[PDB]
């Protein structure tokens, strides 16, 4: 019943973070201290919408 809506392949393109898990873990503490605001906005949107398609931006 109904048709599922999916974003197009162009809609899912982004400049990808191509560093490995060791680099990420080394940076993690300062990364969380510095990039807190966009991350918190995304996670609040993510548990409030309950939908990946509503959180792409």
Binding site for other proteins (CB under 8 A): 43, 46-47, 49-52
**Looking at beta carbons only, is 10 or 51 nearer to other proteins?**
51
**Looking at beta carbons only, is 19 or 52 nearer to other proteins?**
52
Three-state secondary structure along 8-47? CCHHHCCCCCCCCHHHHHHHHHHHHHHCHHHHHHHHHHHH
**Looking at beta carbons only, is 23 or 43 nearer to other proteins?**
43
Shortest distance in whole angstroms from residue 7 CB to other proteins:
16
């Amino acid at each position: 019943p109904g048709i599922v809506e999916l974003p197009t392949l162009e809609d899912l393109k982004v400049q990808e973070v191509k560093v490995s898990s060791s680099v990420l873990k080394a940076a993690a503490h300062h990364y969380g201290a510095q990039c807190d605001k966009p991350n918190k906005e995304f996670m609040l949107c993510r548990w409030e919408e309950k939908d990946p398609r509503r959180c792409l931006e």
